[PDB]
Amino acid sequence: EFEERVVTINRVAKVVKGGRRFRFTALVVVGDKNGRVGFGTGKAQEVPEAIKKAVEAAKKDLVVVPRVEGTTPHTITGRYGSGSVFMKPAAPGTGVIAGGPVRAVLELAGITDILSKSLGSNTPINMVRATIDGLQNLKNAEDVAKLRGKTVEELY
């Protein structure tokens, strides 16, 4: 019903009074299995109760990503923090591979025609923030038609 992508569970070796406190920050993408990105981080002792903790406290950070005719409406970027991304269009009837950054952004948008792009670095805390920067800065067909305030077939 909901494509939840739990990337990893960052641990911490707290060097406080206690011998060695264990704090697992379960990282899970809050995707709605449609086209939204979704990102939430927990801090509970139980990963299962921590993964849903960030899914019930952070589920409004997603963005609606529409599709034209099976191809990305506009090749957007991502200038938020170090890690960056890029939207590359492909044919509707295609697929994705492995080797690079995060995979829970274009995989949520069941279309198999978008290539997930994010160089920046490996840090998965400032690389997903740039993906939502471009997703919210995406240009739609009518979205840009209102900008001019004329016809949809008069701005292409």
Partner: protein
Amino acid sequence: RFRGSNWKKSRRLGISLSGTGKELEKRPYAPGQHGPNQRKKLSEYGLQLREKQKLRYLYGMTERQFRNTFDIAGKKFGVHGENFMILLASRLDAVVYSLGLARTRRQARQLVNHGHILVDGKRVDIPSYSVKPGQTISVREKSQKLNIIVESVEINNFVPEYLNFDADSLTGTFVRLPERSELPAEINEQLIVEYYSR
């Protein structure tokens, strides 16, 4: 042309389509160095480069030697996105992968001498043959019955479209028009239709 192991094509790439079982006795996890770790997510330009490297082990002609292949899958008019799977099946490996001579593409490129080659007249010992409506990729007079040409004559029953093959003949001369969706679909189309353009 690669002069290396033909078992790393289903490990470094994400679209091999050259053998049925390969990860049965191997380890289908991630890469090599961090094979016991998690996998990654192909980058925008990386996915188009991964497919190129994936087809680099599949297609005999590598970078610069497959000029025509890439030139026929770009400037050529028509579905540019699916032009990499449409105008790219004009090699000599397709005839061996439709009649029943070689199950692989690398072995199909070396099957232009041991197997059927005489395409109704002038033959060709290259990885691509000019098989058009009128060419019958068959064998020679002395090499009429070969061992690699008549190997899986009964083992390979099901044949592909736009191809012909019979007993003691294996001469392909059916339809010249092929399908642009009659090949594996794991790589992007518009991605390679734009990246190549540059």
